[PDB]
Design a binder for this molecule. Structure first.
Ligand SMILES: O=c1[nH]cnc2c1ncn2[C@@H]1O[C@H](COP(=O)(O)O)[C@@H](O)[C@H]1O
Ligand SMILES: O=c1[nH]cnc2c1ncn2[C@@H]1O[C@H](COP(=O)(O)O)[C@@H](O)[C@H]1O
Ligand SMILES: O=c1[nH]cnc2c1ncn2[C@@H]1O[C@H](COP(=O)(O)O)[C@@H](O)[C@H]1O
Length: 124
């Protein structure tokens, strides 16, 4: 039922806040977006921009994906993001995360028709 595009929105879109600036944010969000269900997702980024702005990245700077595929795109502008990284002492199911805010260019992979983000590759 859940499309790749919907999964990208679930894992990575958080337009509601301008910057994920609670120290609790990743702990709460990693759980509520179901990224700690079968295991602690080791790293995940949330993007605090409009869906339209993030979708627009698929028409921006074409760059090589980490996996060597050619369908990745880097945002021309920096975007407000939050990096969530599993702590060294995090143990499933009690997944624990460090919350870090940044403004960085995002790199996403795009697929499909319509051509939309389906994977978050990197922030630079
Ligand atoms: O949400 C995500 N999905 C997939 N990869 C991510 C996500 N967020 C960050 N990353 C990548 O994971 C890296 C951290 O892992 P590292 O290679 O051990 O340093 C970051 O530099 C990002 O490129
Ligand atoms: O490029 C892609 N297209 C569709 N699904 C992907 C792609 N890359 C990874 N996935 C899968 O969907 C999830 C994407 O998470 P992300 O890499 O953090 O964005 C991963 O857990 C993979 O299982
Ligand atoms: O200019 C860049 N090229 C490639 N990765 C970058 C760059 N700037 C920041 N990064 C981030 O740093 C990670 C690579 O660092 P590494 O794990 O030490 O190899 C990537 O996952 C990116 O998210």
């Amino acid at each position: 039922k859940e499309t790749a595009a919907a999964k990208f929105e679930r894992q990575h879109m958080d337009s509601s806040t301008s910057a994920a600036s609670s120290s609790n944010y990743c702990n709460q969000m990693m759980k509520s977006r179901n990224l700690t269900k079968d295991r602690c997702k080791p790293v995940n980024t949330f993007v605090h921009e409009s869906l339209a702005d993030v979708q627009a990245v698929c028409s921006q700077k074409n760059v090589a994906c980490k996996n060597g595929q050619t369908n990745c795109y880097q945002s021309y502008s920096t975007m407000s993001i939050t990096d969530c990284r599993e702590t060294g002492s995090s143990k499933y199911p009690n997944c624990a995360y460090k919350t870090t805010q940044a403004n960085k260019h995002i790199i996403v992979a795009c697929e499909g028709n319509p051509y939309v983000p389906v994977h978050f590759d990197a922030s630079v």
